[PDB]
């Protein structure tokens, strides 16, 4: 739990951690992770408001299509270095009000 760093200008916790995924539809995904991209200088010509280009990797190579906003839950989540951190992830998932509270490697393209 020494690799978790909270970022301020975007409500996110960076942590090299993989979480199993359960969404509203029956399709289920194994341990995966998110990558957020804070870009306030992004081309938003259309009705785009988000400053974060948030996407998902399944196994570091499998980027799944966004499609609908799946109602994902953290389920069992592993740091892949020390031990399972399920509580340590779910406890700070709330009181954030930002989608994908815990991601890995925010790119911070300014």
């Amino acid at each position: 739990t020494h690799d978790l760093v909270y970022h301020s200008k975007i409500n996110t916790f960076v942590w090299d951690v993989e979480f199993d995924i359960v969404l509203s539809d029956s399709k289920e995904l194994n341990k995966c992770y998110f990558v957020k991209c804070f870009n306030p200088y992004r081309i938003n010509g259309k009705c785009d408001f988000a400053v974060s280009s948030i996407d998902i990797f399944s196994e570091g190579k499998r980027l799944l299509i966004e499609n609908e906003f799946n109602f994902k839950i953290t389920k069992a989540v592993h740091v892949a270095t020390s031990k399972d951190v399920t509580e340590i992830v779910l406890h700070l998932s709330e009181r954030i009000s930002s989608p994908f509270p815990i991601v890995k490697e925010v790119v911070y393209l300014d």
Binding site: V35, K36, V51, S53, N67
Partner: protein, 642 residues
């Protein structure tokens, strides 16, 4: 006995004997004193005059009226003249010093095996039948090349196999064994002591090279951050320490000790100059006395920044200080150097380019150069060649598609986009489309950006650019090439009207999930009534569930691109929805500041432009920033709400 100041002159100190230097400098100007000198010794005076004017010692301190030293480097390696060094290496060597610089150049092109062999040849042929300077230098360079080979082989064949798939073993195993055997227990500390006693008295100034750390000048660098309210004695020493190592063909210019203080001098100098500015403004005035920052980057400054800095270090430079206030001198020379880098990249990938050590040594400076290029006004042809190289011949193992797009957006900030650059980007998009015909090929990016941003940038710079090639590719589409249709969906604005008409029939809109898929890929621009009715049923479904995308619908309504009024009947639930649909009757006690951290420039501009929420939002932000040190809330407050 004499303090040779780096600014150009010399000052006296501890010369208990006669003042030979003062008399020499006095006779430098008087022609009669020159004439009265003896004939056999006159040529020696001429040689001394040539040496002293070359090294940059002008005059004494009592008459040092002119002291501006224009640094000049004539080394071929500094300017990255690879085409010249290759031709020189192909040319046979006539002497030993020419052989020495051939060895050094061979070391800078990554061919370390040939460089080591040629250094061994020099050692054999110049054992002691000279002044010994070449023998000493070629012993040190040999050891440094051996260290570099060991470090590369412990890393390239150690862990970096995935950087080229399978072990490329750039150095042969027999060669590795030979260099290990020939260099068992080579004492580098005592090497200078093994030289003849005459050498140790004459070339005493070459002692530091045989040391584990020799550049203990960093302790002097602590004078750059003293807050007493110059710095030119450090920059001149940096050039003084670069014209030695890079012009005497020495193999101590690629290690981490050299790169560490160059990354420390060039950072401390710019930071202190940034502190000289923004501090004189406090008591002198913004523009009445704020002429310039003080620092002036030149060709030999940009080259150092390119060669030694990394991307994270450059970003740290940009975050701390505003480099945009620092003008880049000698724009033409920077343009030519960048064009040379682009030519080298183009020639490297197009050819075999299997040689990997030089690739790794040179890709860093190439990336740093094309990163810093945004500060230099590049010529039209030069920019065209730069962009062509960066798009079609830069390896994808180092620069991903997202980083590639970031690089161009960085380059287009300080320069427009004439027809040539947009034509190059159009050709790149065409190449991507032709690559997408393979249904098993997918883009990999570590920045979130993709090929959509290229079309978006083209449209932003040119509102009516219709890529006829893309239109023809769309016309020639089939049903089974689903991935191609998706990719062309991502670039809808760049297609022609008949192309759009043919494409839209392939994939229509469905319910809300596909609706939002089309919105993300920009399928629809004006919200058609059918889309509007589809929206309501989702909200009507939400009411049943309540008795998500709701924030998106509220924001769209706030942006006035949704003109439906019956949705006004559906308020009193989510905070953001009511905020963006009915600011009149919102009770503001439920507002959360975190929302403001997800809004781009235009949304905050529209929020600030509205009267009914400006005061509430600004007082919320002030309350939040009073009790916290968050820079994001203050940044939002000052950029848009003042």
């Amino acid at each position: 006995d004499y303090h040779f100041e780096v600014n150009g002159t010399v000052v006296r100190h501890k010369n208990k004997g006669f003042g030979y230097m003062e008399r020499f400098f006095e006779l430098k100007e008087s022609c009669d004193e020159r004439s009265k000198l003896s004939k056999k010794q006159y040529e020696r005076f001429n040689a001394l005059f040539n040496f002293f004017e070359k090294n940059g010692v002008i005059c004494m301190a009592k008459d040092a009226g002119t002291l501006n030293t224009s640094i000049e480097i004539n080394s071929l390696a500094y300017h990255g003249k690879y085409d010249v060094m290759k031709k020189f290496i192909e040319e046979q060597s006539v002497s030993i010093e020419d052989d020495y610089k051939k060895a050094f150049f061979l070391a800078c092109l990554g061919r370390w095996e040939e460089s080591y062999d040629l250094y061994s040849n020099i050692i054999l042929n110049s054992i002691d039948e000279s002044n010994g300077c070449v023998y000493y230098l070629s012993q040190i360079n040999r050891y440094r090349i051996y260290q570099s080979i060991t470090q590369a082989v412990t890393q390239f064949n150690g862990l970096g196999l995935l950087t080229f798939g399978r072990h490329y073993k750039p150095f042969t195993d027999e060669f590795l064994a030979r260099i290990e055997r020939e260099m068992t227990n080579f004492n580098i500390d005592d090497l200078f002591n093994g030289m003849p006693f005459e050498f140790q008295k004459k070339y005493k100034i070459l002692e530091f090279l045989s040391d584990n750390q020799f550049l203990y000048d960093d302790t002097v660098k602590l004078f750059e951050l003293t807050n007493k309210v110059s710095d030119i004695v450090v920059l001149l020493r940096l050039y003084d320490n670069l014209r030695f190592l890079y012009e005497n063909c020495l193999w101590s210019v690629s290690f981490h000790e050299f790169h560490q203080y160059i990354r420390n001098s060039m950072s401390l100098l710019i930071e202190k100059a940034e502190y000289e500015r923004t501090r004189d403004i406090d008591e002198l005035g913004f523009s009445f006395f704020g002429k310039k920052s003080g620092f002036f980057m030149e060709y030999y400054d940009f080259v150092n920044i390119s060669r030694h800095f990394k991307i994270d270090d450059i970003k740290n430079l940009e975050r701390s200080c505003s480099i945009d206030k620092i003008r880049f001198g000698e724009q033409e020379k920077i343009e030519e150097y960048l064009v040379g880098i682009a030519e080298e990249i183009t020639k490297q990938f197009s050819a075999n380019g299997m040689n990997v050590v030089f690739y790794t040594q040179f890709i860093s400076e190439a990336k740093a150069a094309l990163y810093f290029a945004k500060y230099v006004k590049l010529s039209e042809e030069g920019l065209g060649k730069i962009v062509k190289a960066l798009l079609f011949y830069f390896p994808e193992r180092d620069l991903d598609i997202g980083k590639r797009y970031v690089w161009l957006e960085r380059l287009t900030k300080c320069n427009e986009l004439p027809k040539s650059i947009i034509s190059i980007i159009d050709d790149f998009l065409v190449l991507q489309a032709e690559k997408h015909i393979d249904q098993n090929y997918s883009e990999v990016s570590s920045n979130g950006l993709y090929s959509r941003d290229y079309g978006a940038l083209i449209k932003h710079f040119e509102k009516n650019f219709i890529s006829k090639r893309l239109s023809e590719i769309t016309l020639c589409l089939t049903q089974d090439k689903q991935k191609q249709i998706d990719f062309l969906f991502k670039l809808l604005p760049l297609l022609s009207t008949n192309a759009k008409s043919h494409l839209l029939s392939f994939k229509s809109v469905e319910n809300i999930n596909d609706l939002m898929n089309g919105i993300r890929i920009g399928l629809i621009d004006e919200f058609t009534p059918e889309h509007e009715e589809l929206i309501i049923e989702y909200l009507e479904t939400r009411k049943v569930n309540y008795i998500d995308y709701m924030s998106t619908f509220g924001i769209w309504y706030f942006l006035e691109e949704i003109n439906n009024s019956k949705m006004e009947e559906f308020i009193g639930m989510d905070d953001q929805y009511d905020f963006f649909v009915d600011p009149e009757n919102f009770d503001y006690k439920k507002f959360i500041p975190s929302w403001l951290k997800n809004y781009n420039d235009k949304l905050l501009g529209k929020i600030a432009g509205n009267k009914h929420m400006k005061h509430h939002v600004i007082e919320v932000l002030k309350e939040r920033v009073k009790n916290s040190n968050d820079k994001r809330y203050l940044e939002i407050l000052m950029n848009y709400f003042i």
